[PDB]
Amino acid sequence: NLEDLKGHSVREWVSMAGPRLEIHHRFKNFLRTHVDSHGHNVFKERISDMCKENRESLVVNYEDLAAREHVLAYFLPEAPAELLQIFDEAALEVVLAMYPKYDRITNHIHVRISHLPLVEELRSLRQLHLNQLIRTSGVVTSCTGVLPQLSMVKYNFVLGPFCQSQNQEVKPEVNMEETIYQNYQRIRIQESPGKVAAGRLPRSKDAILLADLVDSCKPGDEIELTGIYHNNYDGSLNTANGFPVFATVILANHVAKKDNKVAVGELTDEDVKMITSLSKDQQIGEKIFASIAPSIYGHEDIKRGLALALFGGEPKNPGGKHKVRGDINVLLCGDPGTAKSQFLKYIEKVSSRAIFTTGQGASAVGLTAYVQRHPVSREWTLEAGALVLADRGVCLIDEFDKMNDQDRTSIHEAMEQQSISISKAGIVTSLQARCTVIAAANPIGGRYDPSLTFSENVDLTEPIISRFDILCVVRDTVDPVQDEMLARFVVGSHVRHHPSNTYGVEPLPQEVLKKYIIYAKERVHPKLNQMDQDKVAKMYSDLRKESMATGSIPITVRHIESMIRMAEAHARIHLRDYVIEDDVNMAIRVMLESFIDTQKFSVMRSMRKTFARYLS
Amino acid sequence: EVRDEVAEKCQKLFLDFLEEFQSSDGEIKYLQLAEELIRPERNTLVVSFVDLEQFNQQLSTTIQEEFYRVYPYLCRALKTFVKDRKEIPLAKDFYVAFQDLPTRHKIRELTSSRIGLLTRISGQVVRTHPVHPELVSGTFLCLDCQTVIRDVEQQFKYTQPNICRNPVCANRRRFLLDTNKSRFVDFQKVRIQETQAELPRGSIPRSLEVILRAEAVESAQAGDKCDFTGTLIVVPDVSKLSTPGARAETEGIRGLRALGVRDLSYRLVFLACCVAPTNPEQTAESIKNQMTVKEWEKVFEMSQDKNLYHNLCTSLFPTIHGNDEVKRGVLLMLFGGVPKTTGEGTSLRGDINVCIVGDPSTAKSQFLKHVEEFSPRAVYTSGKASSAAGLTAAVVRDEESHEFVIEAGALMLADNGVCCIDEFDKMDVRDQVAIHEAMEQQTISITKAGVKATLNARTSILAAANPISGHYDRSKSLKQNINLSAPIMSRFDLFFILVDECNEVTDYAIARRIVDLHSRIEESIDRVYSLDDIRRYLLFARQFKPKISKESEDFIVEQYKHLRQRDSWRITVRQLESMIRLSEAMARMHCCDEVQPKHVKEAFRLLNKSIIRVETP
Amino acid sequence: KTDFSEKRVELLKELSRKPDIYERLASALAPSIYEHEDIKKGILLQLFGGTRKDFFRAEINILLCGDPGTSKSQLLQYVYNLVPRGQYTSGKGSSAVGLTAYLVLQTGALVLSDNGICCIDEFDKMNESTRSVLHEVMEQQTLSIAKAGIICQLNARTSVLAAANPIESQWNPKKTTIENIQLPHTLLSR
DNA sequence: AAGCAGATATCAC
DNA sequence: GTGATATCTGCTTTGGGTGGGTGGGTGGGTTGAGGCAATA
């Protein structure tokens, strides 16, 4: 029996030939026969996906292995290096069996473990975890470049191959041509700021990434790290401490961004089937709109605009000399206590890459990019701010009206040209910043005055206001029926979400919505082939006539391009590869309804009458 | 091998003490404690020195005088005492801690004559270092003969075997360390300082290095005042010593072979086996279990008392005369509501904020001080702050490193507790803007040079404020008397006013109360319940999460409709959620599982009197 | 080192029996200063202090504001020499000895003068942070620090003897005390 | 130039 | 003839910028100019 150890450690047990062969056979059988709840061969699909993409890593979910091979699951945390080597060999055998020509692409398959149940904090690691497989989490604070490390060394006659370990120089000049190398990366992982007690210095660890594990994470990332806790003698540590203390490091096996994030690649065939079937539904647009912050009583315009901003438009560059952004920026502005901050928090929770910041807590350089001073290396370096870090993501700005003016003017270039240009301290460069900006503001005096226009209510000027594709006015009006409905919804929300436990359509589950969004943003690129140019052109002229007469908001060419983005975003919501007439009509309605809301109360009736033909 | 008679005798006698010493109840005191050492995380046993002194005085004296010499043998005795239980691996190491040393020494009494003796000191922790694994006994492979050498002792320096175990082998230089069969211990270095009480007059503070091991690691925090029990040792200059496996790394004694032509100096460090504070996953059932039987019946009696609301109010604030409504509001704040999370991952605030606007010398500071002294986790601060952090975070630059770091403010330090803020109207603009998010979202967000963070501020705020003119004007409304903005005012659940009543009777009552408190400090105070009783009762009551019933639902909806119909201050959804929170707190006050209509009635009474006071003169 | 007895206690009690011991001690307090009798009596009472109830500040705080060229600094120096656990310091930030607490934890003069008297000479020249620190010390008798990973509260049960000058070149009779010396009324009320 | 690590021939018993 | 023990041989040192900023500033180097946040 494999479980029974005849007076050896687990390492010793798995080192000898008999148990080694038994483990190899068991793991190969697990790879070949494991099926899911429906009965589909999991690893047949996983290996096919790996080989189609020409990748070298096979990910194994610890729970499945424990369910099917409990003895191997028990062994794995105690003797990780040996078990992982055996798993690699068996995986290579299976892969070559399925794809006999794959040996040309790679000669090694890495088995990587996910969902390890033994989670530990950076602060909690003790000597009893040494040489064990552990799972921890934190913030990446420092990251090297990808470096070449000796793997199989040859010396100059030419000496025989020599293996290289992570802890000492090998003992036989090196022959560069005949030597074998590996990718090497060192990261520093730190306690997340939200988990360290206030006023306390955070703890940190070092981690080593090898081979195809490199570039799995970037500084500033929230990561879950599974690896081997390893110690090695260090003389200068001993000198420093006066005691024989050993240096520690994590030999990384699996790196994930695990704050509720699923990548397009991780989507399975059944997931895509469900997404496509959903997109076939006739009311899918309404269902997606209803999925935006379901615990808020209806603010249906805000939810629609936020859904459009989440899905996004299509960037274009006709001849390589005229760049047009595809992102849709949103500005919420209205009375206090109307759930603007809750909308922003929901967007932060649902998006894959989102950064939340507030009012006076944001500085100009902190938003875009800053110049870091150093005491010893090159004096000055360039470091990414919020907009750079949120590239291809979302930046949410709360208390947008309370910002310092100098700090608010720093986002103009990023909002339109989608780049940050820095000319400081010998650094002249431009960084990419393609992010959707969603801001929330309060009006002048803390209350929106219906007798005035939007421009009169806010202190923002034309240049910043024009950069927002969608403008939403949140009004808190006293109506007995609406007040009763809101009260009955909110109290029911507090009943439903006790810790013990308008569209007329059922919203999508949040996990389903997250999969749907990632698929549409990655696998759908709607194309604008045909459009009623005369209708859009006539509409634009009418809008510019009325805007000049009333002065409620400025209208620019940017308003034409916003409509095209909204039509593209609407088509993307339906998983359509070509924008159609109903997308253009919806984009027109969204823009005209927004414009009418910026008028004074008296003028609103006339404005609806002026544009009634479109709003029909 | 030569045998140390004294150490072996100490080992035998300590084993006898562990086996035989009897508690008051007649059971073996330390058998039941050693029974806990079967867990992987537990490796240390705490032994009272008074028990050992009672059992055997000669043993205690020998241990005190030869602690450093005999400590390994005491640990071996503990290992033997634990050996019987099957769950312990043969490789596990166990350590002994000594708790109650009758005599104490000052940091400036740590002289050479104390080297190796058992000592107790007090100090304020200045700095803590990261945890390390430290080698205590190495296992080596001999490269000449492949023999395995075990239990090689380490002395401040990485030491390899001197001679190969095999009699035939003559090796002295070539060995290999095997980590998997070596023994390590957790290691932490802390730097402590003299306490302000101990610091001699007109003297620069004297600092000390302390080494914590095994369970003692991460048990003392910078700024804490701690008692350390252990021993004073000398640590040589490792940088000077050369060994076969380890070269030397770049007056004292001369002449050692490992020294070459170099000198060896020494420095004094304290090796602590026990750390304690100098002045010393929850659920209702566990809270009950932590309590003794007397305390549990007292808590039950408190829960059954029909005048509990008034008795608690009077007990908490005995020095203050009048202002019953303010006491009721502060009590409800202390009990709190039920925080909740939505299906989409957003949070519904459950904490309660209260504001007290007062005339000069109206005892609002007294309310804040009473709450601060009562609460276990509470921070008292001022709106006008001495540090750049203020009530929220600040970003400051380390000159040497040039790095930017967060300095925490009051609301961060009070996370999961109560923040009493005095002079709430003197805040600065940065704090004013940040407090919106802090009060509603319970988070503080920063995106500045070198810092990108979301910090927790889950706090209940009790604020004290002055009117704009310096005297409250009854003709005006409360909104007209204070300089708080309407958005900030909407974030407070309750508002109270304290007016100087130019009345002879009130003056006579207040003067009598103050003079009586000063004349008879002990006799003046008469509490139906002691503060410890209330602390235990609050701890028990916070574990209840009352559920809103249907009838309470209807009543709350009707009350909100009435408030909106009645009405830049306005009734928002925040008033509705404040009413929900107050009803939940009222139910919690009686350790109840459902919010009944009576609780809603009381909460609405309080909130309606707050809103009316906000609106009308 | 180059710089009670029963008979001494008997002498002290014999003095305490004298009918005018209050005025005798007041006269002895500062023989050089001229004709400031009430100030001397107040400073004597501050030196003696009130009763430590241990339930209540027992400490007496005194502020001497006035025109330049009076004898304020001399009085502060005489009190500083008299008290055993006293500190003499200045409100100006550039000052060599600071009031605020600032690896070695350095407690300021206010903490060092715990159970003693702190003499603060240029009271009006304090910056806002120092004013906040002083208000905290006078109201709560503690000093909180959260810096460099150190979080702690330091006991500061100290009596403040402060000296203040007007903002103008001379005291302005048309101006009240508050507007003559630019300090908050909240701090003056302590 | 100064000193430790390693190699090795050499006296002594 | 084996165990010291005395002689001989080769390594690398120093702080230093031709030994790097793709080693790291918790391994250690004054002076000035240049970005930040908090400041007034």
Ligand SMILES: Nc1ncnc2c1ncn2[C@@H]1O[C@H](COP(=O)(O)OP(=O)(O)OP(=O)(O)O)[C@@H](O)[C@H]1O
């Ligand atoms: N109603 C009262 N009952 C008992 N004591 C009172 C009352 N009102 C005032 N006092 C006394 O007044 C003093 C409290 O002053 P405190 O510092 O708390 O005032 P405050 O409201 O903070 O005013 P300010 O900040 O302007 O000094 C204590 O002596 C307290 O006994």
Ligand SMILES: Nc1ncnc2c1ncn2[C@@H]1O[C@H](COP(=O)(O)OP(=O)(O)OP(=O)(O)O)[C@@H](O)[C@H]1O
């Ligand atoms: N009432 C007084 N009694 C004794 N000497 C006095 C008196 N008033 C002024 N003087 C003299 O004035 C000088 C005192 O100056 P001092 O430094 O004490 O002033 P100050 O009140 O601290 O004022 P400032 O700092 O504004 O100059 C000494 O010459 C002292 O003899």
Ligand SMILES: Nc1ncnc2c1ncn2[C@@H]1O[C@H](COP(=O)(O)OP(=O)(O)O)[C@@H](O)[C@H]1O
């Ligand atoms: N329409 C609504 N539906 C549900 N809850 C609401 C609604 N409006 C406000 N709330 C609640 O009121 C509280 C305060 O809202 P908040 O996020 O502060 O809005 P704002 O930032 O616009 O003032 C939130 O906890 C939110 O849940």
Ligand SMILES: [K+]
């Ligand atoms: K260097």
Ligand SMILES: [Mg+2]
């Ligand atoms: Mg808000």
Ligand SMILES: [Mg+2]
């Ligand atoms: Mg006060």
Ligand SMILES: [Mg+2]
């Ligand atoms: Mg003077």
Ligand SMILES: [Zn+2]
């Ligand atoms: Zn050997």
